[PDB]
C-alpha cells in the first residue's frame, strides 16, 4: 500500500543505502540527522560541507549540493 522500499525489504533496521546518510553510508547518530526535502535523503551535521556544529534555524533544509553550480552532466548521444 505505502512506499514499500525493496532495498529495505520493508524492514527499516536493515542497512539500505537509499534511506541512509550516503555521505558515511549509515543511519546512526539520529540526533545529528538533517533530511533534505527535495533529495528525500538523510545527512548528518558532521557529514556537511561546511560541517555545521548545530542545526540551522531554517525549517525547510537544503544541502550544499542543492545550491552547487557544478551540477551532474546529463549524458548526451541518445
Ligand atoms: Zn530503503
Ligand atoms: Zn552521515
Ligand atoms: Zn539536497
Explained architecture:
- It is classed as peptide binding protein.
- Keywords: Plant Homeodomain, NP95.
- It forms a monomeric assembly.
- Solution structure of the PHD of mouse UHRF1 (NP95).
- The protein: E3 ubiquitin-protein ligase UHRF1.
- The organism is Mus musculus.
- With 78 residues, the chain is mostly loops.
- The protein has one domain (6-66): SH3 type barrels.
- Helix content is 0%, strand content 10%.
- The chain contains no helices and 2 strands.
- A two-stranded antiparallel ribbon has the order 1-2.
- A hairpin with a 4-residue loop joins strand 1 (33-36) and strand 2.
- The protein is globular and about 35 Å long.
- It binds zinc ion (3 copies).
- Residues 36, 38-39, 62-63, 65-66 line the site of one zinc ion (ZN).
Features:
SH3 type barrels, Histone, peptide binding protein, little secondary structure, 78 residues, globular, two-stranded antiparallel ribbon, binds zinc ion
DSSP strand tally = 2
CATH fold-level name: SH3 type barrels
| Whole-number total of structural domains | 1
What ligands does this structure carry? zinc ion
Strand line-up in the sheet with most strands: 1-2
Q: Whole-Å distance between the termini?
A: 36 Å
User: Helix tally?
Assistant: 0
**CATH architecture call:** Roll
Zinc finger (PHD-type): 2-69
Region (Histone H3R2me0 binding): 36-40, 56-58
Subcellular location: Nucleus
Protein name: E3 ubiquitin-protein ligase UHRF1
Topology of helices and strands:
Elements: E1 33-36, E2 41-44
Antiparallel strand pairs: 1-2
PDB class: peptide binding protein
Keywords: Histone, Plant Homeodomain, NP95, H3K9me3, peptide binding protein
Assembly: monomeric
